[PDB]
Amino acid sequence: KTAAAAAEHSQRELDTVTLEDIKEHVKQLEKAVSGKEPRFVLRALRMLPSTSRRLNHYVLYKAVQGFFTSNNATRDFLLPFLEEPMDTEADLQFRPRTGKAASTPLLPEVEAYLQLLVVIFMMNSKRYKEAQKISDDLMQKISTQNRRALDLVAAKCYYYHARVYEFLDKLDVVRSFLHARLRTATLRHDADGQATLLNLLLRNYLHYSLYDQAEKLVSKSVFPEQANNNEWARYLYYTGRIKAIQLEYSEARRTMTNALRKAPQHTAVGFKQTVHKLLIVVELLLGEIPDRLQFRQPSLKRSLMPYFLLTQAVRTGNLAKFNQVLDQFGEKFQADGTYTLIIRLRHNVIKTGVRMISLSYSRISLADIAQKLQLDSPEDAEFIVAKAIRDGVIEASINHEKGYVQSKEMIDIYSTREPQLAFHQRISFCLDIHNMSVKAMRFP
Amino acid sequence: EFLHAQEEVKRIQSIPLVIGQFLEAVDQNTAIVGSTTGSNYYVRILSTIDRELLKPNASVALHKHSNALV
Amino acid sequence: GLPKNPDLRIAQLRFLLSLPEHRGDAAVRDELMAAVRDNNMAPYYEALCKSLDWQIDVDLLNKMKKANEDELKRLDEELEDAEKNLGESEIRDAMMAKAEYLCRIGDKEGALTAFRKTYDKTVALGHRLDIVFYLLRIGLFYMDNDLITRNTEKAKSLIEEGGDWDRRNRLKVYQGLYCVAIRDFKQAAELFLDTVSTFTSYELMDYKTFVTYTVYVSMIALERPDLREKVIKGAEILEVLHSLPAVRQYLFSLYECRYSVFFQSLAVVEQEMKKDWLFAPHYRYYVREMRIHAYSQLLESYRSLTLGYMAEAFGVGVEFIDQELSRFIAAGRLHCKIDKVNEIVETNRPDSKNWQYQETIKKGDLLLNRVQKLSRVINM
Amino acid sequence: QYYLSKIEELQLIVNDKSQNLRRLQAQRNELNAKVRL
Amino acid sequence: DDEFEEFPAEDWAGLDEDEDAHVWEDNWDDDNVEDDFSNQLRAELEKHGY
Amino acid sequence: TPNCRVALRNDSYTLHKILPNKVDPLVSLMMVEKVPDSTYEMIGGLDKQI
């Protein structure tokens, strides 16, 4: 019994440590209300998920009954919804509010936080109906109270609300909520809330493959630049994916590499896996040879080994081997949603090989290119080089005599100037950096 | 206006220098030098030139009438 | 420092018996001749894979191992129990004898344990240098690249800072990490031309083997600039090429740019590197990189050299040279194009300005990527 | 009072931009005083 | 701090071996499969007759 | 403080700042020496004399 008692006492001590973390959060909001500073609010929201992975029904009920010294609708909602365990030997001195603290009404910020914390705790417990009810109460309270600092909270609140509704499969129904809060955020200039709601809407259109509506909304909805880093990364990745579906290739590669760089390197393992697969497929379709250093990703070895074989097949120009490996391990490609693109690469391998061999050779025979890339037909080789030149990916031309292709030339007026023309945005970066400094040099 | 003033105050002449050897940098904004004719006197060191070439006992240059570290 | 060198030899023999199945008759003979000796039972958990589970010496050889290890263990117990010698005393060399027993006789695990033990115990300059050397030698023995990197890191960071004229005794195997790895291009050569050996013939199995490593590393390194004044001028270099005629043969063939003998000698070089555990560039930098350099050297100062004549000036098989050129142009080097309808090699060598311009725009791309990442770092 | 809030946010932006704007002027004036000294 | 498990986190289920377990840097060509060069040169010498 | 260095003025020569020592660094070594270590442990063979 000694070992079990010691383990239970230790886990109760960690429960009390988590309760002290929640108490520190409450003190953080007391300070935030005192100082009118939402940045330290952002710190509280950043530090919540770190401790979110270990909570207990009993310690949550402890925090509820302690913080709600004055009777309130939050306590009345948590009393039936939160199912604390049976009697526990450990109790704490629950008296945080006395006198004026109990007399003063509850803070809307801490109310939104208790609601969001209850919904995250319900999802951790794998409950759905109580979580949706708490989230509805949260959005109702945030809509009713019209303070400026609340909408910054409302951004991540609506974010996680729609994430819950995605598990609920109410991800279609929550669209009305998303659009209503979008209109409220448009009224209140809530850029972060707007960013969150567009991210949730884009994930909804992804889960329903509603890509035509997604692109029609993205092409008209302006996304805030100064938004949160994570929301920016999610939005940019979704935009890159939909551009890849739309065949917007240069924009797709730009957006996907930007999203990979914007994502935290230490975290976002699933996001990283998705961006590796996206870059592999899209750049192989482009013929842009995939980055070899990316294969050293410790979390993507098994997923990229068939991707490595796909790269090898793209370079070689063979068909049967990669068709076999797709029949073997193409189900994950279908789950990722690139299998249509997978077949598109399977049949554009010849295009990519033609680009590479045209870069290799000056005047290559059409018969030679057909033999190299398994065309076995002079007319098909001529058609392929025609299609490459009309696409403008390469400079290989056609002379119906034998297949002549022009070579390069020495550097002209603009060939030395295009780098400076495309790179002199350095001073634009400098000026935005200086303006950010001007904004962020508060003295007190 | 302030960029103009900053780039305007940066004239520092320094064309007609003379040589009188430095003794050592006692501190910043203070120093002691020995002229060619001797006459060791304490001077003020400007911030334009510093340790990068302010080695202890190397011959240095001074202003014609100001004998100041240039 | 002589120990772990015959161990290196037996490790290379195990390599030759295991990886190439062509050597499966003479490799067995040399492996047996050097494993029935050297007390190979604890270092036979690796040898069981190729040959039988255990050669027929079990009783006698295991008795010898256990008796020797027990005698050394008794000696160590006496020194560490009856006598309270601590720190700067003979207990340090007693534990060195313990580690020598556990290494030259026993398996690497006990040797590593005794090493780490005395390293954490005594931190004197000489003791620390000796143990760092032993750790590097055992790591390069058992091909623990992690251990090799660890000892190399600590030595190059702090251990070699304290104490001089011994880095000259250690760099020859400290650069073996670059030697065994792919990095045979710049760093290995730059720190490995030093012809100051800690022993006349040890560490890397010989001074001749040391020279062969030098020649391979330099050949990977560069083509033909004032390499005449860098390695050819080396008097010891010319002497050792006199000692090894075929080595002198391919080295002078590359220097003279005579491809007819160069390609045969280069194939011989690749075959020799196969028989060597330092075979990391199995498909990248045995012969393909060297001939990339050679072809660059050849077609540079040329504009349109015919495929048919460059083939006979560079071996035979015009089709073989054509496919090689196509493959290497696809690889990226060999700055030229092929006029197939006329079978010509039209090079495209940029001017100094043009090529350096290209390098600057490449680095501008890389650093725009860098500054965009840093702009991500800011504002978050 | 919501247009009042919007005007207050605009005033906050102006104040934040004017912070470093005044600080840069003050420190450059200090630099000019230093060079005059 | 969260790991963003919402995006599909399909960890690689092999956990068997690192193919490039050392610091070797591979190239797109380095992983082509052939009988190296010595055998190919031998075949070239044979087809030319020596 | 006596036996140190000072800064003076141009005409009136009034004091400016009491400079650190300049006489000592310049002529520290003429025919004398300050205290070395050369401890008696190094001294050997003459114990009956020391």
Side-chain angles (χ1 to χ4, degrees), chain A residues 76-88:
Chain A
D76 315 299
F77 301 153
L78 276 296
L79 184 56
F81 290 162
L82 175 53
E83 207 65 29
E84 57 271 53
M86 305 180 301
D87 173 60
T88 312

Side-chain angles (χ1 to χ4, degrees), chain A residues 229 261-264 315 359-365 368 404 407 411 416 419 423 426 429 433 436, chain C residues 322 326 329-330 336-341 346 351 353-354 361 365 368-369 372-373 376 378-380:
Chain A
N229 187 83
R261 286 191 307 174
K262 292 252 182 303
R315 172 74 76 85
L359 265 63
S360 168
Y361 266 52
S362 52
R363 281 75 178 272
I364 190 167
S365 301
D368 184 69
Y404 289 168
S407 296
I411 301 299
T416 61
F423 287 147
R426 299 286 75 78
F429 294 164
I433 300 299
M436 183 177 176
Chain C
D322 186 74
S326 305
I329 294 178
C336 67
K337 295 182 176 63
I338 309 303
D339 194 283
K340 198 55 185 294
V341 303
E346 293 178 335
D351 291 326
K353 164 272 201 173
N354 196 333
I361 67 183
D365 291 331
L368 187 153
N369 183 20
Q372 283 271 0
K373 188 178 178 301
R376 182 264 179 178
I378 193 66
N379 186 85
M380 71 178 295

Side-chain angles (χ1 to χ4, degrees), chain A residues 316-317 350 353-354 357 364-385:
Chain A
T316 310
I350 309 182
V354 164
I357 199 62
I364 190 167
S365 301
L366 61 83
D368 184 69
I369 190 167
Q371 297 159 33
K372 180 62 62 179
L373 286 186
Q374 307 292 343
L375 277 296
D376 303 68
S377 184
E379 294 294 328
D380 296 66
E382 294 173 339
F383 304 155
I384 284 185
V385 301

Side-chain angles (χ1 to χ4, degrees), chain B residues 13-40 43 45-61:
Chain B
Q13 295 85 0
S14 301
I15 297 183
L17 305 185
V18 301
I19 292 182
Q21 186 139 343
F22 199 13
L23 177 63
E24 190 185 13
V26 169
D27 287 85
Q28 202 66 35
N29 312 326
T30 32
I32 163 183
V33 308
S35 68
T36 305
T37 174
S39 66
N40 296 263
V43 307
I45 154 181
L46 299 322
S47 175
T48 61
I49 190 72
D50 204 64
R51 180 252 299 269
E52 59 274 357
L53 286 93
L54 208 57
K55 252 46 188 179
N57 298 320
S59 308
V60 311

Side-chain angles (χ1 to χ4, degrees), chain C residues 146-164 166-173:
Chain C
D146 63 358
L147 288 178
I148 301 166
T149 52
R150 184 177 179 179
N151 57 64
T152 308
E153 283 173 0
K154 58 168 168 55
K156 301 196 307 176
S157 305
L158 277 296
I159 315 304
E160 292 319 277
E161 175 174 340
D164 200 327
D166 189 358
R167 47 172 50 254
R168 71 184 63 186
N169 290 318
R170 189 43 46 173
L171 73 165
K172 50 184 297 183
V173 287

Side-chain angles (χ1 to χ4, degrees), chain E residues 9-23 25-27 29-44:
Chain E
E10 285 72 36
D11 296 64
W12 63 272
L15 203 171
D16 178 72
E17 57 180 12
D18 185 10
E19 208 66 27
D20 203 319
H22 38 280
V23 297
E25 293 83 3
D26 63 358
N27 194 330
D29 188 59
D30 295 357
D31 291 331
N32 54 23
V33 182
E34 61 181 0
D35 53 326
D36 291 331
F37 163 79
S38 57
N39 297 115
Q40 302 189 2
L41 183 63
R42 294 173 56 259
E44 163 196 323

